[PDB]
Enzyme design. Structure first.
Site, PDB file in Angstrom:
ATOM      1  N   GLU A  31      10.413  -8.157  -4.203  1.00  0.00           N
ATOM      2  CA  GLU A  31      11.080  -9.425  -3.815  1.00  0.00           C
ATOM      3  C   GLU A  31      11.932  -9.181  -2.572  1.00  0.00           C
ATOM      4  OE1 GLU A  31      10.384 -12.439  -5.120  1.00  0.00           O
ATOM      5  OE2 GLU A  31       8.818 -11.183  -6.089  1.00  0.00           O
ATOM      6  N   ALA A  82       8.395  12.781  -3.414  1.00  0.00           N
ATOM      7  CA  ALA A  82       8.380  14.215  -3.752  1.00  0.00           C
ATOM      8  C   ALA A  82       9.159  14.388  -5.070  1.00  0.00           C
ATOM      9  CB  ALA A  82       9.083  15.000  -2.645  1.00  0.00           C
ATOM     10  N   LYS A  92      -4.387   1.764 -11.338  1.00  0.00           N
ATOM     11  CA  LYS A  92      -3.328   1.526 -10.325  1.00  0.00           C
ATOM     12  C   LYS A  92      -2.570   2.771  -9.923  1.00  0.00           C
ATOM     13  CE  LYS A  92       0.492  -1.751  -9.632  1.00  0.00           C
ATOM     14  NZ  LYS A  92       1.476  -2.659 -10.313  1.00  0.00           N
ATOM     15  N   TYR A  93      -2.460   3.795 -10.797  1.00  0.00           N
ATOM     16  CA  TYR A  93      -1.685   4.991 -10.360  1.00  0.00           C
ATOM     17  C   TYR A  93      -2.337   5.821  -9.259  1.00  0.00           C
ATOM     18  CZ  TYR A  93       1.079   4.496 -14.775  1.00  0.00           C
ATOM     19  OH  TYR A  93       1.887   4.026 -15.777  1.00  0.00           O
ATOM     20  N   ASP A 133      12.092   7.815  -7.362  1.00  0.00           N
ATOM     21  CA  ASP A 133      12.083   7.723  -8.830  1.00  0.00           C
ATOM     22  C   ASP A 133      12.263   9.158  -9.390  1.00  0.00           C
ATOM     23  OD1 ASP A 133      12.023   6.600 -11.364  1.00  0.00           O
ATOM     24  OD2 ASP A 133      10.006   5.798 -11.250  1.00  0.00           O
ATOM     25  N   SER A 163     -25.785   1.615   7.817  1.00  0.00           N
ATOM     26  CA  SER A 163     -25.364   2.752   8.652  1.00  0.00           C
ATOM     27  C   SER A 163     -23.859   2.969   8.640  1.00  0.00           C
ATOM     28  CB  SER A 163     -25.803   2.532  10.094  1.00  0.00           C
ATOM     29  OG  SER A 163     -25.439   3.691  10.842  1.00  0.00           O
ATOM     30  N   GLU A 217      11.942  -2.312 -11.656  1.00  0.00           N
ATOM     31  CA  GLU A 217      10.736  -1.591 -11.297  1.00  0.00           C
ATOM     32  C   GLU A 217       9.836  -1.543 -12.535  1.00  0.00           C
ATOM     33  OE1 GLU A 217       9.485   1.356 -12.641  1.00  0.00           O
ATOM     34  OE2 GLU A 217       8.017   2.008 -11.084  1.00  0.00           O
ATOM     35  N   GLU A 218      10.460  -1.386 -13.707  1.00  0.00           N
ATOM     36  CA  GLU A 218       9.619  -1.183 -14.927  1.00  0.00           C
ATOM     37  C   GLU A 218       8.815  -2.423 -15.306  1.00  0.00           C
ATOM     38  OE1 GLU A 218       8.960   1.641 -15.867  1.00  0.00           O
ATOM     39  OE2 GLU A 218      10.695   2.952 -15.983  1.00  0.00           O
ATOM     40  N   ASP A 236       7.776   3.912  19.391  1.00  0.00           N
ATOM     41  CA  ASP A 236       7.085   2.678  18.880  1.00  0.00           C
ATOM     42  C   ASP A 236       5.632   2.910  18.618  1.00  0.00           C
ATOM     43  OD1 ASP A 236       9.573   1.322  18.992  1.00  0.00           O
ATOM     44  OD2 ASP A 236       8.936  -0.076  20.624  1.00  0.00           O
ATOM     45  N   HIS A 254      -3.639  -2.472   3.427  1.00  0.00           N
ATOM     46  CA  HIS A 254      -3.948  -1.229   4.163  1.00  0.00           C
ATOM     47  C   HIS A 254      -5.429  -0.904   3.948  1.00  0.00           C
ATOM     48  CE1 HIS A 254      -3.423   2.945   5.529  1.00  0.00           C
ATOM     49  NE2 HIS A 254      -2.120   2.743   5.699  1.00  0.00           N
TER      50      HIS A 254
HETATM   51 CA    CA Z   1       7.992 -13.212  -4.852  1.00  0.00          CA
HETATM   52 CL    CL Z   2       9.048   9.091  -6.835  1.00  0.00          CL
HETATM   53 ZN    ZN Z   3      10.500   4.833 -12.901  1.00  0.00          ZN
HETATM   54 ZN    ZN Z   4       8.910   4.088 -15.643  1.00  0.00          ZN
END
Ligand code: CA
Ligand code: CL
Ligand code: ZN
Ligand code: ZN
Ligand SMILES: *[C@@H]1O[C@H](CO)[C@@H](O[C@@H]2O[C@H](CO)[C@@H](O[C@@H]3O[C@H](CO)[C@@H](O)[C@H](O[C@H]4O[C@H](CO)[C@@H](O)[C@H](O)[C@@H]4O)[C@@H]3O)[C@H](O)[C@H]2NC(C)=O)[C@H](O)[C@H]1NC(C)=O
Ligand SMILES: *[C@@H]1O[C@H](CO)[C@@H](O[C@@H]2O[C@H](CO)[C@@H](O[C@@H]3O[C@H](CO)[C@@H](O)[C@H](O[C@H]4O[C@H](CO)[C@@H](O)[C@H](O)[C@@H]4O)[C@@H]3O)[C@H](O)[C@H]2NC(C)=O)[C@H](O)[C@H]1NC(C)=O
Ligand SMILES: *[C@@H]1O[C@H](CO)[C@@H](O[C@@H]2O[C@H](CO)[C@@H](O)[C@H](O)[C@H]2NC(C)=O)[C@H](O)[C@H]1NC(C)=O
Ligand SMILES: *[C@@H]1O[C@H](CO)[C@@H](O[C@@H]2O[C@H](CO)[C@@H](O)[C@H](O)[C@H]2NC(C)=O)[C@H](O)[C@H]1NC(C)=O
Ligand SMILES: *[C@@H]1O[C@H](CO)[C@@H](O[C@@H]2O[C@H](CO)[C@@H](O)[C@H](O)[C@H]2NC(C)=O)[C@H](O)[C@H]1NC(C)=O
Ligand SMILES: *[C@@H]1O[C@H](CO)[C@@H](O[C@@H]2O[C@H](CO)[C@@H](O)[C@H](O)[C@H]2NC(C)=O)[C@H](O)[C@H]1NC(C)=O
Ligand SMILES: *[C@@H]1O[C@H](CO)[C@@H](O[C@@H]2O[C@H](CO)[C@@H](O)[C@H](O)[C@H]2NC(C)=O)[C@H](O)[C@H]1NC(C)=O
Ligand SMILES: *[C@@H]1O[C@H](CO)[C@@H](O[C@@H]2O[C@H](CO)[C@@H](O)[C@H](O)[C@H]2NC(C)=O)[C@H](O)[C@H]1NC(C)=O
Ligand SMILES: *[C@@H]1O[C@H](CO)[C@@H](O[C@@H]2O[C@H](CO)[C@@H](O)[C@H](O)[C@H]2NC(C)=O)[C@H](O)[C@H]1NC(C)=O
Ligand SMILES: *[C@@H]1O[C@H](CO)[C@@H](O[C@@H]2O[C@H](CO)[C@@H](O)[C@H](O)[C@H]2NC(C)=O)[C@H](O)[C@H]1NC(C)=O
Ligand code: NAG
Ligand code: NAG
Ligand code: NAG
Ligand code: NAG
Ligand code: CA
Ligand code: CL
Ligand code: ZN
Ligand code: ZN
EC number: 3.4.17.21
Lengths: 696, 696
Positions: free
Chosen positions: B379, B481, B645-646, B399, B574, B370-371, B612, B635
């Site tokens: 992936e 959370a 990005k945060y 996390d 508009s 993740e880092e 669904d 989205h």
């Molecule tokens: Ca990939």
């Molecule tokens: Cl988290």
């Molecule tokens: Zn982390």
């Molecule tokens: Zn981190």
């Protein structure tokens, strides 16, 4: 009982004939008042026939029309600039329609305006290989020339794209009697052949699945933001016009320069088929001049959408769709199909009025503007893409019911092969000599499969019809069926009166299907398929039939690559991953099939789980990133050929990466892209296989 | 009874503490042997805890590491080229870990190599507005300068992108005590503050959701075709390195040129915060020199994936996921979260061993890398995207469980607001002064919502964590959370010891959560959510809560546009269509809610239909064409801010089209693109609404 037999027995040849007559008395050109009136009629009738709701869904899309006070035509012009020969301004109307108004004259929809003047080059069918032969072998340069090409073999949009890339400044399309006059048959009205004044209309876009040129991705609704013309998708950049073979003879008879390179380049007219450029010595200073004044204009179109709500799974949609707009009278294209859909709706509505409902919801569609690029079907699917993605079981197309009177033709996903075999074994053959035998038996006898023996031919889906958005964009299992001509005599150019004013009710009633028995057979096949799809407890798809074809396509694409053994060694080009994935697919599909047969039949969630795995299997072959430069062709197994939109190509991403690869100037880059496309295909096949594994 | 109370009561603070100790004794850097050993341990324990299957899913992805025999550092260099000052080669290790091996020294992951030399410019936080101020207002040119920026306010990758676009030839990042030293608290080990030798590690990519830089779109499996480095996604083109504030003071104390433009540009060190370029008169010939020798290398990573098969709907997946790789010991990030997930698995497994199963399948994941850019989660999701698209109910991230000890923090989709309110009303507050009161009451009191009163704050999802692929790529309802610090004192820079060697078990046990009660509260909130999602008969999503926020976001984006009334008049801009769509969404969602309450509770197909519709509602906000130049952010309502990005941005396509629009040289084109993005948003909102209409 309300079963499939009840549905099938209610269909009547005589009703299909009455509807065909009703739909073909006046032209129904997309975007015209006549075609809106017909939409309103079909909406009212489907309501009377008993559907739960019937609505019009309209869009404002780019269409194209000649200018009524400034007609299109082509000239031979002498060194003074006198036009010494002019092509016709209209087709001679057939008997009894010489007073019909609003017959659109022959033109190439979406051509830009212009009056280019120049020397002709004859380019045969204007195929990719025709241009290779001209440029590479014969050294003929088309840059700044007007090219003349015979219709046939490939979609006309590909011809125009190919001429444009060769540097042509105009394209003239014509119908050669070699490709549109069957030996021994008389010209319309005395037989089904194309007369010398006959001309094939048709659009010349290269949309690659986009739909309305101005709104790719999104429906052309009331608030849509439109691209400007210069950024529109798919429009040709050089003027284009179609002519018949009387006029073509006049343009070709004076051709000079090089001889045709071989007999595959000669049609049937009494001319040499010289390639040019330009005319023979005495006429070398005469030129050819086009005059094109058609205009592109945003115009409202209307789809009719009927719903027969499902009793058990209303949120699962089985769609029967075909278009309603025609170039002129649409005696074959599309009204022979629309009459068949009309009678199917009537039969389902009969059963409904007696209290029956199919298990799943059935949607019926009368699409508009198919002739202008699949616009109606594609705008509706853009609008409803989330519903279709998550709820669409299958799409059965319903354009022309006949293109011959010889045998059945079916093109569909492998997922429908078993359903088609089984249904046709339960239907009566309409063929002479097969009285009391099944349709399966006559079809297998007249159209043997190349691979299998004891089995009938079933082709891949290509494109050039309204299933394209459902199958190649959205990944909904799709199929089509009609009566067709002999595959042995099939020159792949279309029936002779295709998109001509001579395609009338009389053509069909007199020469194709006087008893409407082939129409009835096609209504039984299309309607039978819809019935089984909408009513079978287990969806009638056999994943193992996809496994078999995947191996065939993997063999085929490997064989293409193996024409370049030295490069495969140099760049370490392996097909191992794709064969591995196809092996896994075969193994998993076999195990899923065992569970589907053995699963506890009492458990409906188990049932809805396994029906969802079946429904999402076609969906799994979609790559959301699309194929290279063709974002709307997202299915990894099937795309329309990059050289001929009508034809399907298998493993299209790998096929195009390999095509003409020996001509690429950076072979390392080219074979790198081959490897990339192998990885994408192997991954997608494995991922589709994994959707059939146990879920947890 | 096996109900949620049984699950919740089984969770123990003491177990979470034991697991946290166990996971934080040695570093677990992505791609190292230690982190593969830990993966194998977690796999074995989840098996012992009772999951049905537990597998490792591995990938070979681009990672980045300093060169062990050629360390990174920065110098001040005099006119001879003597390096008269050198930044540190490592952080002083904390007490009792001075003999731990394999502590990776501070570095910026994915920096290219280089040894650029030049004059410094100080750029504050290197935000888009910081560079606007420098270039537009102060006329300072960063071209060919080394920029020094303080960490904080925005993701470091955005800082580096912004410096690169300003023409910098290198970037130095540092931690200012203004942003990483809380008044009155001692430095580690005596308190939770950052010491002057402390340094924050972190990657500096701009992946925009792509995952592994070399394989965007497809999993980095054994046969994957990889892009070459020059075509990789997201890599910085200039060298970058992070330092602590002792070293930063040495680089900044000599700064000349312009004064800081105002006090928002001054941190807390005893230096002037001059912008430069270069040093004051006496030192004007000294330069700054970086030495970066890190290498990018394809390296294997391992996710652990555990499955607890559903009893009723095994083909519906509720996912609890968080990462396992850490920069060093990961005392807070991520192991405070991983210990919480470990104890949740243990509790579910306890109930399972007694014969219970959740209604739906629960997937548990321990993600790797993740880092290094969310690589493990992304992936895996690429590999399994078809299963997740059609079967994914919800994703709960896991996390760090704590970043403070003040109150609850929740960021999630509106679809989870009601679930979160209801669950927290049933949980005990761990806070001093709220003994015997609910978590809802303490949370609402300490973190009031800005809009609602009597309601707690719940933020939009941004990015910078492992939910990004699930939420913004695939459109699976997602949430997170944790316990957090006071919003009133929140400078938005992260807790002071973030990504430093000082983030240890002792930090947590001594200064953050000695009784592990906040950890336990977070295990109850995350585990409670998973429980309700996997076990409620009706999915616990309230579509009407999306309707409310959509109106708030539509108001907000309209207000932004209305800063330009003259251009909205000129270009006929508009927002009517978007407000119309949001109105329709509100009306349809209200009616769907009535049916969901009134529907025949006996009918499971009706139940699976309506579940669904709930599951696919988040899915409906996905646009398969993605946002402009960001194909993996699909989205339409939420994307990570293009400037940070945060942070989440609402109506991101319209927001970016409006951003800085008064500076665009072709206003017609710019406002055209605003209109285009309005059309896309209105269409997507209407289409999502229509998925909640009756199905047929
Ligand atoms: Ca990939
Ligand atoms: Cl988290
Ligand atoms: Zn982390
Ligand atoms: Zn981190
Ligand atoms: C078809 O299905 C099959 C069988 O179910 C599936 O087989 C999988 O093949 C992969 C790819 O070869 C195997 O991957 C290996 O996994 C082990 C750990 O389990 C690794 O140690 C291996 O890596 C070593 O060896 C490599 C190859 O020489 C080296 O490049 C590497 O550096 C390592 O030293 C390797 O990753 C995998 O274990 C099996 N899985 C199973 C369940 O058997 C196959 O991939 C499927 N086909 C497709 C196209 O998906
Ligand atoms: C929110 O839901 C509402 C109500 O359900 C939905 O309303 C629809 O609005 C559209 C767009 O205005 C309507 O479209 C009209 O349809 C009629 C035929 O039904 C046409 O004749 C209209 O076109 C004429 O007028 C136009 C506008 O002045 C001209 O531009 C045009 O050239 C024609 O002369 C027009 O297309 C539609 O009928 C309603 N539908 C219903 C069921 O009421 C609204 O669109 C939804 N919002 C969004 C953002 O989808
Ligand atoms: C095609 O058939 C339709 C339906 O039978 C005909 O339309 C009907 O015409 C009658 C008499 O003019 C009207 O009173 C009805 O209102 C029409 N019904 C509908 C649903 O439109 C139509 O005339 C036929 N067209 C041709 C060319 O024969
Ligand atoms: C082909 O059509 C063109 C255009 O109608 C004819 O040329 C025109 O003839 C009229 C009548 O003589 C003149 O007034 C125009 O000035 C001419 N226009 C152009 C554009 O040249 C031409 O005569 C026709 N040729 C043949 C053989 O019928
Ligand atoms: C309808 O079917 C008839 C019978 O097969 C077709 O005519 C025959 O076909 C071939 C030409 O391909 C000839 O060898 C036979 O001599 C023909 N027989 C007769 C009686 O004509 C006819 O072509 C079909 N109609 C259409 C439009 O395809
Ligand atoms: C086509 O019909 C065949 C033959 O009836 C079907 O295959 C049979 O299906 C039954 C019912 O599950 C099995 O018990 C038999 O063993 C199958 N026979 C064979 C030879 O496979 C087949 O399922 C039908 N295909 C479709 C799509 O319905
Ligand atoms: C973290 O906890 C695990 C599990 O209790 C420890 O791993 C076990 O160590 C024992 C004794 O060395 C072995 O016999 C077991 O095989 C291990 N179990 C597993 C599942 O790996 C590990 O030693 C602990 N780590 C630390 C740093 O305390
Ligand atoms: C900062 O580090 C550099 C590099 O280690 C030091 O410069 C080196 O010093 C050694 C020992 O005197 C020489 O043999 C090298 O030739 C020098 N290398 C370079 C690249 O200049 C420098 O002395 C250190 N500076 C301080 C103030 O400690
Ligand atoms: C754990 O909680 C305590 C109690 O709130 C925090 O310390 C207090 O917080 C503020 C500073 O923001 C001061 O005004 C109080 O005087 C502090 N009280 C004490 C006893 O220190 C402490 O900051 C929290 N720990 C962490 C890591 O956030
Ligand atoms: C959160 O709890 C509220 C209050 O219990 C739930 O709303 C009730 O749901 C019941 C059961 O359907 C309805 O009959 C009540 O009328 C509802 N009360 C109110 C005030 O709306 C709500 O559904 C729960 N939310 C979730 C996601 O479970
Ligand atoms: C068609 O041509 C006429 C007559 O020459 C011209 O006045 C008119 O502008 C054109 N119509 C369209 C729709 O372009
Ligand atoms: C064709 O003609 C144009 C110039 O008239 C030229 O640019 C092009 O290179 C020519 N190509 C060949 C192969 O003759
Ligand atoms: C690291 O630096 C050393 C010593 O200067 C060099 O020999 C080696 O190539 C480098 N290692 C890597 C992985 O780049
Ligand atoms: C910044 O510096 C470079 C040349 O050294 C130049 O290309 C660029 O235009 C400069 N810009 C400004 C605004 O001074
Ligand atoms: Ca469109
Ligand atoms: Cl068809
Ligand atoms: Zn047609
Ligand atoms: Zn047609």
């Amino acid at each position: 009982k309300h079963n499939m037999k009840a549905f099938l027995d209610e269909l009547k040849a005589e009703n299909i004939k009455k509807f065909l007559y009703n739909f073909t008395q006046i032209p129904h050109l997309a975007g015209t008042e006549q075609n809106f009136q017909l939409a309103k009629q079909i909406q009212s009738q489907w309501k009377e026939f008993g559907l739960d709701s019937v609505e019009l869904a309209h869009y404002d899309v780019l269409l194209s029309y000649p200018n009524k006070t400034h007609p299109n035509y082509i000239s031979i012009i002498n060194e003074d600039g006198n036009e010494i020969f002019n092509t016709s301004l209209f087709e001679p109307p057939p008997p009894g329609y010489e007073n019909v108004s609003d017959i659109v004259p022959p033109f190439s929809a979406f051509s830009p305006q212009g009056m280019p003047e120049g020397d002709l080059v004859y380019v045969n069918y204007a195929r990719t290989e025709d241009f290779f032969k001209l440029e590479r072998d014969m050294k003929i340069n088309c840059s700044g020339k007007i090219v003349i090409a015979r219709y046939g073999k490939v979609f006309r949009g590909n011809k125009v794209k190919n001429a444009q890339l060769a540097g042509a400044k105009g394209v003239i399309l014509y119908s050669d009697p070699a490709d549109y006059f069957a030996p021994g048959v008389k010209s319309y009205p005395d037989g089904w052949n194309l007369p010398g004044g006959g001309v094939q209309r048709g659009n010349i876009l290269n949309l690659n699945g986009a739909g309305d040129p101005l709104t790719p991705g999104y429906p052309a609704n009331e608030y849509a933001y439109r691209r400007g013309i210069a950024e529109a998708v798919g429009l040709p950049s050089i003027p284009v016009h179609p002519i018949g073979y009387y006029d073509a003879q006049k343009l070709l008879e004076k051709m000079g320069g090089s001889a045709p390179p071989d007999s595959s380049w000669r049609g049937s007219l009494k001319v040499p088929y010289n390639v040019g450029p330009g005319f023979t010595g005495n006429f070398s200073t005469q030129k050819v001049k086009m005059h094109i004044h058609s205009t592109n204009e945003v115009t409202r179109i209307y789809n009719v959408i009927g719903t027969l709500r499902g009793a058990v799974e209303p949120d699962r949609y089985v769609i029967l769709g075909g278009h309603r707009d025609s170039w002129v009278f649409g005696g074959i294209d599309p009204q022979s199909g629309a009459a068949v859909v009309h009678e199917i709706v009537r039969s389902f509505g009969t059963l409904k009025k007696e209290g029956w409902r199919p298990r799943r919801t059935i949607l019926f569609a009368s699409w508009d503007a198919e002739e202008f690029g699949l616009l109606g079907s594609t705008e509706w699917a853009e609008e409803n893409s989330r519903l279709l993605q998550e709820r669409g079981v299958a799409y059965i197309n319903a354009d022309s019911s006949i293109e011959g009177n010889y045998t059945l033709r079916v093109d569909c996903t492998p997922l429908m092969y078993s359903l088609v075999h089984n249904l046709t074994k339960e239907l009566k053959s309409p063929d002479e000599g097969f009285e009391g035998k099944s349709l399966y038996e006559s079809w297998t006898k007249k159209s043997p499969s190349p691979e299998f023996s004891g089995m009938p031919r079933i082709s891949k889906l290509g494109s050039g019809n309204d299933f394209e958005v459902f199958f190649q964009r959205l990944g909904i299992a799709s199929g089509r069926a009609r009566y067709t001509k002999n595959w042995e005599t099939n020159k792949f150019s279309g029936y002779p009166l295709y998109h001509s004013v001579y395609e009338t009710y009389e053509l069909v009633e007199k020469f194709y299907d006087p008893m409407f028995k082939y129409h009835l057979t096609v209504a039984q096949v299309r309607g039978g398929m819809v019935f089984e799809l909408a009513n079978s407890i287990v969806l009638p798809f056999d994943c193992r039939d996809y496994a078999v074809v995947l191996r065939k396509y993997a063999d085929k694409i490997y064989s293409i690559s193996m024409k370049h053994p030295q490069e495969m060694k140099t760049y370490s080009v392996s097909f191992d991953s794709l064969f591995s994935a196809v092996k896994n697919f075969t193994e998993i599909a076999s195990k899923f099939s065992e569970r589907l047969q053995d699963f506890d039949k009492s458990n409906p969630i188990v049932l809805r789980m396994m029906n969802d795995q079946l429904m999402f299997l076609e969906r799994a072959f979609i790559d959301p990133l699309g194929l290279p430069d063709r974002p709307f062709y997202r299915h990894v197994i099937y795309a329309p050929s990059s050289h001929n939109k009508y034809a399907g190509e298998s493993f299209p991403g790998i096929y195009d990466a390999l095509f003409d690869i020996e001509s690429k100037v950076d072979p390392s880059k080219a074979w790198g892209e081959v490897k990339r496309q192998i990885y994408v295909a192997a991954f997608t096949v494995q991922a589709a296989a994994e959707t059939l594994s146990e879920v947890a």
